[PDB]
Structure formats: structure tokens, C-alpha cells
Design a protein around this ligand. Structure first.
Ligand SMILES: [Mg+2]
Ligand SMILES: [Mg+2]
Ligand SMILES: [Mg+2]
Ligand SMILES: [Mg+2]
Ligand SMILES: [Mg+2]
Ligand SMILES: [Mg+2]
Ligand SMILES: [Mg+2]
Ligand SMILES: [Mg+2]
Ligand SMILES: [Mg+2]
Ligand SMILES: [Mg+2]
Ligand SMILES: [Mg+2]
Ligand SMILES: [Mg+2]
Ligand SMILES: [Mg+2]
Ligand SMILES: [Mg+2]
Ligand SMILES: [Mg+2]
Ligand SMILES: [Mg+2]
Ligand SMILES: [Mg+2]
Ligand SMILES: [Mg+2]
Ligand SMILES: [Mg+2]
Ligand SMILES: [Mg+2]
Ligand SMILES: [Mg+2]
Ligand SMILES: [Mg+2]
Ligand SMILES: [Mg+2]
Ligand SMILES: [Mg+2]
Ligand SMILES: [Mg+2]
Ligand SMILES: [Mg+2]
Ligand SMILES: [Mg+2]
Ligand SMILES: [Mg+2]
Ligand SMILES: [Mg+2]
Ligand SMILES: [Mg+2]
Ligand SMILES: [Mg+2]
Ligand SMILES: [Mg+2]
Ligand SMILES: [Mg+2]
Ligand SMILES: [Mg+2]
Ligand SMILES: [Mg+2]
Ligand SMILES: [Mg+2]
Ligand SMILES: [Mg+2]
Ligand SMILES: [Mg+2]
Ligand SMILES: [Mg+2]
Ligand SMILES: [Mg+2]
Lengths: 70, 101, 87, 116
RNA sequence: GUGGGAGAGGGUGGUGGAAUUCCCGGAGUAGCGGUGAAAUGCGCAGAUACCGGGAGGAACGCCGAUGGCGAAGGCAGCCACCUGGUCCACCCGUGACGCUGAGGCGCGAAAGCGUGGGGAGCAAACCGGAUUAGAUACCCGGGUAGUCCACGCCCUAAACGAUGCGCGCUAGGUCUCUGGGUCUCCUGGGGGCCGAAGCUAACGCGUUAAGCGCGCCGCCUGGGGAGUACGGCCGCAAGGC
């Protein structure tokens, strides 16, 4: 599989308002992807997690979603 | 004075009589708390990720200001008073940390 | 907090000479200011105990330098204490 | 007496029972069945066979109101959670989609001693 | 000092979604629940399951880690204010101002105590149902003090690295968090793993020492009796030293 940082551009990790790029870091559910799937670094993932939670409170990113399978 | 960022999401059903009033109310609240506004960005109608106040959308505002720090929490209290105002999040400004640079 | 504007104002006021940033009078002045920033922060917020530890370490450091000034030149010790209103 | 012909089907599967409800697209139920509605009484309700018969009983009850298209919602892990779904696709009801909506808390309530 | 840095460090206010419970309504029949099987329990006054709306309290899923912070206890939603510690680069300033530390003073998970609130979930005692030779228990259904908040006590612990603190010295390899750098790497400060010399009774430790040294404090001298008795100090008590 590919990783998120691998297929992406030069983006702002601290911008909670850019949903289009932050949607890439969420799974099928609203969960935050692990480092193995995002290809981020230690400091990067910690900053991403906080900026994702901000977008959630602004109604921009989902807290949780519904899985369509099984 | 430090530099902050204000996020306001209000009811996306207002006409221009109510939208101008709610926003000029927001201007009046910034004046009384001494917020020198640096720039503004208005997104407006945006699809929300979950229902907020039974409403699937939200009208988005964003202000970047420079104000005294002690008065921030009272400025947040003054904005949530309005019924049409739904989300008020104020964040201290930060540097645009780049990744995959 | 304590901005560098207020910082330079104290160093230049208690410097033994231009360019002095580390005199015993300068350290005690700087220590004393952060003492008062905390002792007023601890009038309210009486339940902040982890900040209370930092205060006890600054008082010890302030008294450690004053006990030193006492032994070498007791005059500048009195000139300092009278200028800061201590003890 | 309703003539819905399309609606949702919720599967609540626990280790002690598997129960099926068939509703209309708005959520209001039409009929329903469970492991106890069919003859099974005790631990036999949380078995995949009971899960299969319960799913098929509600399906034929929904045939009375005229159901053809069905959307499936599943909640809970348990024996026969999958056997109920498999019973629903072959029930004649053309299954539209299948969604897992099992409620997971964000660590909000203290569980019973059993779950710790 | 200057300039940078990371962080569930702390305190205050504010705030967000999921979930549980309960209330309201819509819809809907005959059971749900629970166990190795069951029964008490709940259900025709209409439950469980489903949709919508509302109230309340508590805890923060994913991120999350073999991770980070703190002196220890311990600290996870998010935002802001107040705030502590710490680390690096520059080689600027003072010029031995240092280390430890009997007393004292302050902190101190949980449980418990006082006053006043709060009370959703859980749950000592207790009320039941089972199991059993018996059940004063594990399992099941209920359930009060309590868990939460404010203010004041209590001072215990496997309070654990069962390893006091500070410093110097003594091969490296590898994983990592975070800084700086001439950025295959070098160089610091933490957190892991192998292992030189050496130590250890052995297991094992081994630049985070249990090695080689030095300074200072604490403490040990057979088991049961016994952390008991007496006395004292402290405590409202339980009880602690
Ligand atoms: Mg409002
Ligand atoms: Mg059963
Ligand atoms: Mg904090
Ligand atoms: Mg806090
Ligand atoms: Mg009802
Ligand atoms: Mg009865
Ligand atoms: Mg009855
Ligand atoms: Mg009755
Ligand atoms: Mg209530
Ligand atoms: Mg975890
Ligand atoms: Mg540490
Ligand atoms: Mg611990
Ligand atoms: Mg700080
Ligand atoms: Mg020099
Ligand atoms: Mg010099
Ligand atoms: Mg000189
Ligand atoms: Mg010391
Ligand atoms: Mg002592
Ligand atoms: Mg205590
Ligand atoms: Mg307690
Ligand atoms: Mg009490
Ligand atoms: Mg209970
Ligand atoms: Mg019980
Ligand atoms: Mg027996
Ligand atoms: Mg009996
Ligand atoms: Mg021992
Ligand atoms: Mg020793
Ligand atoms: Mg670098
Ligand atoms: Mg190291
Ligand atoms: Mg050897
Ligand atoms: Mg030994
Ligand atoms: Mg080893
Ligand atoms: Mg050593
Ligand atoms: Mg002793
Ligand atoms: Mg003896
Ligand atoms: Mg004892
Ligand atoms: Mg005696
Ligand atoms: Mg006594
Ligand atoms: Mg007494
Ligand atoms: Mg005792």
C-alpha cells in the first residue's frame, strides 16, 4: 500500500481548516490513522492529531463514521 | 498583545438583515474588547461532518486579531451569547509547520 | 509572564556597570522579580502546589546569593537589601 | 396494511440473544422477531441457528407488508451475528447494503466487573 | 544573560462529540435479560429492539507508543489565561557563590473522617436468585455509604528501579524521544535493549552501575512473640510516627 505523506504535496500540518487534505488522514471511519499508514514522523503525527481534533470541534472532520461492508 | 485566530460558525439560514446584524454585533464585541483586526476570511456555507443544532451545514467566519491576552475568555463568553452563534473557537496563532517539504 | 522589555529594565537598573548581566546584585534582582510574580500568582490559585515548589527553589537561590554577598562585601549587601525591601 | 416495500433491518447480536427488527426508511419499525419469539427459550437463543430463524421470521413478516428492498444495520458482536446477515440475503429480500453501527463509547461509563 | 526548543508538568475558567441511564413523543408485539445450565428480576400500566427530541452526571475512543512530563505521588477531549521545571546554541557576565542534609516546614494514589452539595454508570455492607455436602464466596438480579465537586482533616502502600543524592572516571553496538550542526553522519540531554573490563552467592548489573573512587544523610545485626505492649507526640475518629 501507499502512505499518505508519500502521495501528497507540501502542506501545512497546523492548518485545521483544510479539510480536503485532513480527510486523507482519516480512515473509512472518522478514526485517526496510525503512523504506519500515514508515513509521518513522531513530531508530525503529534501535531496532526491536535489539528484533527480541532477540525472535529468545528464540525469539519467527523468524530466517527459508519462502516459499509461485512 | 498576542495574536489570535477566531473561528465563528453560525446558523446558515439568515437573510441579509440578520446576517449583517449578527456580524456587526461581532464587530461591536471586538471593539469593546480591543481587538485590532489584521485580516478576514469568510467561507460561508460549508458541509458539516455531523449535525450541529439539528442543522447539516454551517456558515463559517475567520478573524485574525491582536488583542490583550487577559480579555480572551471574556470575549469568548460575549460571542456565545447570541442564539445564531453556535461555534466559537479562539486559538493562539502559530507558525505554518510544513511537512513533506 | 515576564517579557524581555521588563527584563532589560531591571538588569540596567541593577548592573554594577554597562554590559554586566551576571553580577550578584543582578541575579538577586531578577530572582526577586520572579518571586513577586509567583507570590501574587499564589495568593489566588492556592491549590497550585507544583508551582509552589519552584518558588521554594528560587527563595533558596536568592538567599544563597545574599548569604554570599554578606561574607564578601557587606556594604553592597545593605545597599541591595535596602533597595529591594527584604529581610 | 402499510405497503412499505423498502426499509431498514437492524440486527442486535449479543452473546445471549440475536434479535431482528425491520423498519421503514424513517426508522419506525414494521415487524420484528428474536430468538425467543421462535420456540427457543434459554441459551439456545444466542446460537447461529436461532439467529438464522429469527432473521427469516421477520423477513416473512415483512413480506406481508410487501418488503422487497432492505438496508441492513448490525450492532453487537455475538454468535450468529453473521449467520443472520447470510439468512437475510437469501430470504428473497434483495439486500441493498450492510452497515456496522455498533456503538463504541469514548470511555465514558464504568463497565460492570464482568467487562474489566 | 541572550536567543531558541519540546512536553497528559500544575492551577483557573470555558467547551465538544460518542456512550450509559432516565423522561417525552412517534412507531411496534411477547418477551427481554442473564448463565455451564438456570432462577430471583423486569414485561399487557405495552418492556427489549428502532427513529426523533430533551435532561443529568461521570470518563475522555482513534491519535497511543516498548512514548512524553514531573522530585515523588502522579498527569490523557479541546480552547484560553495564570504558571513551574527542564534542555540546546552563543562563550557574554558574576568569580567557589559548591555537594549533602539530623530537625523544621511543604507535598503526598487509593481508602476512610467532618460540613454542604451532587448523584448517570459502577459498587463494601446489605436484600435476593442460584451453585453446593454447606455458600457467611467466586457466577446472576437489585442496591447504601462511596466513587465526582468545594473547604478542612487523615500522612499509610509492592509510595518499586524492592536500587538515597551529587560528582568524576571506565570498550562499543543498536532502537528511540528532543535540540544544534559543516545533516552517509557528528555532537549534546533523556528513555530501552545487547554486551568490554570489572563486580556479584547466583540470577544478573554493566557511560541511566549493582564497576572504580570520594563526600554526606537514612537504615540494618536470627525467626516466632510483634509493628504487639507501655510511654509520648499527632488525630474529630479510624489510626499513624
Ligand atoms: Mg449560542
Ligand atoms: Mg440466552
Ligand atoms: Mg497541562
Ligand atoms: Mg490542566
Ligand atoms: Mg415510551
Ligand atoms: Mg412478573
Ligand atoms: Mg407484570
Ligand atoms: Mg407487575
Ligand atoms: Mg438527575
Ligand atoms: Mg492505548
Ligand atoms: Mg523524566
Ligand atoms: Mg507508578
Ligand atoms: Mg513554560
Ligand atoms: Mg568567559
Ligand atoms: Mg570572564
Ligand atoms: Mg573578572
Ligand atoms: Mg538539594
Ligand atoms: Mg527532612
Ligand atoms: Mg493523602
Ligand atoms: Mg481519596
Ligand atoms: Mg465525604
Ligand atoms: Mg449494577
Ligand atoms: Mg453485584
Ligand atoms: Mg462441594
Ligand atoms: Mg441457598
Ligand atoms: Mg529486602
Ligand atoms: Mg551507597
Ligand atoms: Mg537536525
Ligand atoms: Mg543515552
Ligand atoms: Mg568477564
Ligand atoms: Mg550486591
Ligand atoms: Mg543487561
Ligand atoms: Mg555511578
Ligand atoms: Mg527503623
Ligand atoms: Mg528475637
Ligand atoms: Mg501498622
Ligand atoms: Mg515505657
Ligand atoms: Mg499509644
Ligand atoms: Mg487526643
Ligand atoms: Mg493499621
Amino acid at each position: 500500500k501507499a502512505k499518505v505523506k508519500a502521495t501528497l504535496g507540501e502542506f501545512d500540518l497546523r492548518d485545521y481548516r483544510n479539510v480536503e487534505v485532513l480527510k486523507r488522514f482519516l480512515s473509512e471511519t472518522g478514526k485517526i490513522l496510525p503512523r504506519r499508514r500515514t508515513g509521518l514522523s513522531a513530531k508530525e503525527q503529534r501535531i496532526l492529531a491536535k489539528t484533527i481534533k480541532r477540525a472535529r470541534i468545528l464540525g469539519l472532520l467527523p468524530f466517527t463514521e459508519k462502516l459499509v461492508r461485512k | 498583545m498576542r495574536r489570535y485566530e477566531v473561528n465563528i460558525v453560525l446558523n446558515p439560514n439568515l437573510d441579509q438583515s440578520q446576517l449583517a446584524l449578527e456580524k456587526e454585533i461581532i464587530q461591536r464585541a471586538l471593539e469593546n474588547y480591543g481587538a485590532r483586526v489584521e485580516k478576514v476570511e469568510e467561507l460561508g456555507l460549508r458541509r458539516l461532518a455531523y449535525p450541529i443544532a439539528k442543522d447539516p451545514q454551517g456558515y463559517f467566519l475567520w478573524y485574525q486579531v491582536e488583542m490583550p491576552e487577559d480579555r480572551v475568555n471574556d470575549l469568548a463568553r460575549e460571542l456565545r451569547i447570541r442564539d445564531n452563534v453556535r461555534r466559537v473557537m479562539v486559538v493562539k496563532s502559530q507558525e505554518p509547520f510544513l511537512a513533506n517539504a | 509572564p515576564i517579557t524581555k522589555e521588563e527584563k532589560q529594565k531591571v538588569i540596567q537598573e541593577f548592573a554594577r556597570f554597562p554590559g554586566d548581566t551576571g553580577s550578584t546584585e543582578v541575579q538577586v534582582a531578577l530572582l526577586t522579580l520572579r518571586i513577586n510574580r509567583l507570590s501574587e500568582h499564589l495568593k489566588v490559585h492556592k491549590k497550585d502546589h507544583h508551582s509552589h515548589r519552584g518558588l521554594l527553589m528560587m527563595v533558596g537561590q536568592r538567599r544563597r546569593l545574599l548569604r554570599y554577598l554578606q561574607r564578601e562585601d557587606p556594604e553592597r549587601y545593605r545597599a541591595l537589601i535596602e533597595k529591594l525591601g527584604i529581610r | 396494511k402499510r405497503q412499505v416495500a423498502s426499509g431498514r433491518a437492524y440486527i442486535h447480536a449479543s452473546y445471549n440473544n440475536t434479535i431482528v427488527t425491520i423498519t421503514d426508511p424513517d426508522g419506525n419499525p414494521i415487524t420484528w422477531s428474536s430468538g425467543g419469539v421462535i420456540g427457543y427459550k434459554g441459551s439456545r437463543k444466542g446460537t447461529p441457528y436461532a439467529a438464522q430463524l429469527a432473521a427469516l421470521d421477520a423477513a416473512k413478516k415483512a413480506m406481508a407488508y410487501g418488503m422487497q428492498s432492505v438496508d441492513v444495520i448490525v450492532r453487537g458482536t455475538g454468535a450468529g451475528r453473521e449467520q443472520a446477515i447470510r439468512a437475510l440475503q437469501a430470504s428473497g429480500l434483495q439486500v441493498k447494503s450492510i452497515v456496522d453501527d455498533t456503538p463504541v463509547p469514548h470511555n465514558g461509563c464504568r463497565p460492570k466487573k464482568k467487562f474489566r
